[PDB]
Amino acid sequence: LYTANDFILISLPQNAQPVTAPGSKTDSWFNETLIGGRAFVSDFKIPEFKIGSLDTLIVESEELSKVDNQIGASIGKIIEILQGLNETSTNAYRTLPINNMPVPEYLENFQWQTRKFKLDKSIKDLITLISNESSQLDADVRATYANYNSAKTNLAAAERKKTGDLSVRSLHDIVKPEDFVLNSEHLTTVLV
Amino acid sequence: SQKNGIATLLQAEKEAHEIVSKARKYRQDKLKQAKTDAAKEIDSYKIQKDKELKEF
Amino acid sequence: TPNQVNDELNKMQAFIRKEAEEKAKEIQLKADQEYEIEKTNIVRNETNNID
Amino acid sequence: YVTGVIARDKVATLEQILWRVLRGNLFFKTVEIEQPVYDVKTREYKHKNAFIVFSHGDLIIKRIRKIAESLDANLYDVDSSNEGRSQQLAKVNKNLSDLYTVLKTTSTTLES
Amino acid sequence: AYVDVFINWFHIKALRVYVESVLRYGLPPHFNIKIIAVPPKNLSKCKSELIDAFGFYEPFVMYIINL
Numbered sequence: 001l002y003t004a005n006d007f008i009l010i011s012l013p014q015n016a017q018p019v020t021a022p023g024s025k026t027d028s029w030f031n032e033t034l035i036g037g038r039a040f041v042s043d044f045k046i047p048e049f050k051i052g053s054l055d056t057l058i059v060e061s062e063e064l065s066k067v068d069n070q071i072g073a074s075i076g077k078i079i080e081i082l083q084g085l086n087e088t089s090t091n092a093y094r095t096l097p098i099n100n101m102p103v104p105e106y107l108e109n110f111q112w113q114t115r116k117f118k119l120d121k122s123i124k125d126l127i128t129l130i131s132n133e134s135s136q137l138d139a140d141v142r143a144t145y146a147n148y149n150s151a152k153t154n155l156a157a158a159e160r161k162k163t164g165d166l167s168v169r170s171l172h173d174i175v176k177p178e179d180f181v182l183n184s185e186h187l188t189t190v191l192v
Numbered sequence: 193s194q195k196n197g198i199a200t201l202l203q204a205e206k207e208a209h210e211i212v213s214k215a216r217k218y219r220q221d222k223l224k225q226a227k228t229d230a231a232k233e234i235d236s237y238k239i240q241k242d243k244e245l246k247e248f
Numbered sequence: 249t250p251n252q253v254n255d256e257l258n259k260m261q262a263f264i265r266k267e268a269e270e271k272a273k274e275i276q277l278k279a280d281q282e283y284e285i286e287k288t289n290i291v292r293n294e295t296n297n298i299d
Numbered sequence: 300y301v302t303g304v305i306a307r308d309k310v311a312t313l314e315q316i317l318w319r320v321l322r323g324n325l326f327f328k329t330v331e332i333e334q335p336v337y338d339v340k341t342r343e344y345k346h347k348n349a350f351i352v353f354s355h356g357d358l359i360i361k362r363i364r365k366i367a368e369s370l371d372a373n374l375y376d377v378d379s380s381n382e383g384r385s386q387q388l389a390k391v392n393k394n395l396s397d398l399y400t401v402l403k404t405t406s407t408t409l410e411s
Numbered sequence: 412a413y414v415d416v417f418i419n420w421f422h423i424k425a426l427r428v429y430v431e432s433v434l435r436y437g438l439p440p441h442f443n444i445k446i447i448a449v450p451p452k453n454l455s456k457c458k459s460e461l462i463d464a465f466g467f468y469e470p471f472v473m474y475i476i477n478l
Contacts, residue, residue, distance in 0.1 A: 002448060002449065002450040002451055003448070004451075005448060005449055005450060005451040005454070006448075006449060006451075006454055006476060006477065006478045007446050007447065007448040007449065007476075007477045007478055008446065008447045008448075008449045008454065008457055008458075008461075008474070008476050008477065009424070009428065009444065009445070009446035009447070009473075009474070009475060009476070009477050010444060010445065010446075010447075010461060010472065010473065010474045011428050011431055011432040011435075011436065011442050011444040011472045011473035011474070012442070012443055012444070012465075012471070012472045013432075013436040013441070013442065013443070013472055014441040014442050014443040015441065016466060018464050018465060018466060018471075018472075019464055020463050020464040020465075021464070025443070026443055029443070029464075030445060030447070033464045034447070034457065034460055034461060034464065036453070036456050036457065036459075036460040037447070037449055037450055037453040037456060037457045037460065039447050039448065039449055039450055039453065039457075040447060040448060041445045041446070041447035042445050042446075043444055043445040043446050045442065045444075046425055047429055047440060047442075048425075048426055048429050049440060051266070051433055051438070051440065052267075053267045053355065053356050054260075054263050054264075054267070054321075054323070054354070054355045054356045054359060054434075055354075055355065055356020055357060055358035055359045056356065056358075057323075057430060057433060057434050058321050058322065058323075058356070058358070058359060058362075058434065059358060060430055061322055061427070061430040061431060061434055064423065064426055064427035064430050065427065067423050067426075067427075068420070068423055068424055068427050071416065071419060071420035071423050071424075072420065074416050074420070075413075075416060075417065075420055078412050078413045078416060079413075081412075082413060088413075094478075096413040096414065096417075097414065098413065098414035098417045098418065099414060099418060103417075104448050106417075106418075106421075107421075107446060107448065110421065110425055110446075112418055112421065112422060113422045113425050113426075116418075117419075117422045123426070123429075123430070126426060127423070127426050130419060130422055130423050130426065131423065133419060134416055134419040134420065134423065137412055137415055137416050137419065138412075138416060140412075141412045141416070193250070193253070194253065194326075194327065194328060195328070196254075196257070197253060197254065197256070197257030197326055198257075198326045198328060198353060200257050200258075200261055201257060201260055201261060201264075201326045201353050202353075203261075204260075204261035204264045204265060205264060205355070207265070207268075208264050208265060208267070208268035209268075211268045211269065211272050212268060212271060212272060212275075214272070215271070215272035215273075215275045215276055216275065218276060218279070219275055219276060219279030219283075222276075222279055222280055222283045223279060223282070223283045223286070225283070226283035226284060226286060226287035227283075227286070227287065227290065229287050230286075230287035230288070230290040230291040230294070231290075231294075233287075233291045233295075234290070234291050234294035234295060234298070237291075237294070237295045237298055238294075238298045241298050241299070252466075255437070256323075256324035256437070257324075257326065258437070259323070259324065259437025259438060260323075260324060260325065260326065260355070260437075262437065262438050262439070263323075263355065263437065263438050264355050266438055267355070319468055321434070322430075322431055322434040322435050323434040323435055323437065324437075
């Protein structure tokens, strides 16, 4: 199966035959030139074909590396958040359902770069938009996790109060406010 | 060869510069023609107005 | 390896040529559109003054 | 384009870092120097070699500048045109001849 | 989010792969790029196998491992 392992992606040029041992390229490449694992390998072109200048290409490559690192960090943070619920952490972290499918099923193609991400506008623009959207979603997830952590801390602080008989009272579930000490002739009686 | 590659890169850069200069020159010529084209239409409209005034 | 070096040089030359051609085509199209718009605006202003 | 000189032993690493810093490729050329140059930064008469490269974008040229400066490789403003390069070399020699004369005279005066 | 940001990251990775294949590999753009979900223990072997079958920071064309 290997439906939850790490996935290896290559971008070998479509021109030559990367097979070191002669073999044949393309499908024969994935079947023999990488037969050591002899694992499934496929993809369909989804080119952000808009190509700027060489300097623009290199700058966009560096920005893409930075955005990929940021997205990986966001994915790790999301894995940690799921570990907050710990049900997805008990199972494989990859088992979370994405696009009505598991990870290998979705990764069986990559055509999702059609409408939502961009519309073949510009490589720099597409990278900027994808990075901004991912950053906003990651910020929202971080804010939700922070709110959940704050609520858990509040619950822990509330439960830390010993139910009476100590420096922390049990006024929530004690007989203090309802006792006969409630009101006095010209004062209110309270002591424990 | 490395020298052949360097010469080819220099020739490609020169051709790119020539193409950019030709594009800029074509842009300037088109702008000048459009300015001249607007002048011709304005002159024709003024001639029509003068003819109308003469008819009146 | 000579084929690889020649391929790299050809790739650099092709990238340069593609960038130059794209820039020239964009410049020509934008210049034609701007020239048409400016000619229309100038003709309209001159016609308004003549009117 | 790229013009500069650097130690002949480190030219291979300079070429590797040029090929790697830009994920594609760029033209390159090199030539060893006839005699070592007593670089101020090196403070010794270490061997050197000329470094020449080429690129399209201006940002790539700026990155080449930055990495060459980081690699302690000084740069010079050469002239692509043969006539311009010849004129620059002639001016450099004209100044340099007076420089040899003045250095010889001042060394003689100091030693005397 | 583990799906939305997942799709965003996959698209970002596709953009990075396109940028690399348009820089390392030269124009005109074309690529037999394919992502192989390797067996769990075979990842090191595949890198050894692929780098063996590579006519060359990873060398040759982009072979950036995912996850």
